[PDB]
């Protein structure tokens, strides 16, 4: 009736819970999100140091809609009694999966770095 | 006909164009998203170390459907030839509003940090 976790991020997962940590390694992949290159347009943008000189106002590439395509090593299919640690944006592309989870309420060190995490999240 | 870009992020944007870079000011300000605690539940996790063994599964909090309810300094009114340089995020979260763009195309350092985008962002 408990589900094995599996690590679908490349980072490990620290949980910090009650009972004390609980570490997912990472997995041996690099994950890569497949975005389309969304319709490239310029946008007019005044230099800062020259607010008011539209002279020297710089044309900005400005992407409009970037869309995603699905992830490069695909999502493993569903297996009873088995959840799935993945990012939230992946999770939110995948609102059908009630298996997948992200690591949530993080704890930093010092240095910024996230050294656990002390719930997990998921879609309602 | 040029706009003023209005930086609504902590940190300085550093667009790299051809034209060479153009810097904007981080602003003075904590951003916080007001997020609202979902429906609190429970999790029943194996160990890793213990893969088989249910006596010794952890009891892991999962917080079900975390929603958006704004952000703490709200966002400034439109104004006529400003754009607000936000998060993505931030952006996705306001689809009505046509003047919001994000940092895009990130150009990370040696060490991770981003040093620049090559373009700026926006929705559809």
Do not use: K, M
């Amino acid at each position: 009736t408990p589900v094995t976790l599996v690590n679908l991020t490349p980072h490990e997962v620290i949980l910090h819970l009650d009972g004390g940590p609980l570490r997912l390694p990472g997995a041996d992949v690099v994950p890569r999100l497949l975005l389309s290159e969304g319709r490239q347009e310029t946008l007019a943008v005044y230099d800062p140091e020259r607010p008011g000189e539209a002279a020297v106002a710089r044309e900005v590439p400005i992407a409009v809609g970037a869309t995603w395509l699905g992830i490069d090593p695909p999502l493993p299919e569903p297996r009873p009694g088995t959840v799935y640690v993945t990012s939230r944006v992946v999770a939110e592309h995948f609102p059908e999966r009630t298996d997948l989870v992200w690591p949530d309420d993080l704890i930093r060190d010092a240095d910024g770095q996230v050294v656990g995490a002390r719930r997990l999240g998921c879609l309602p």
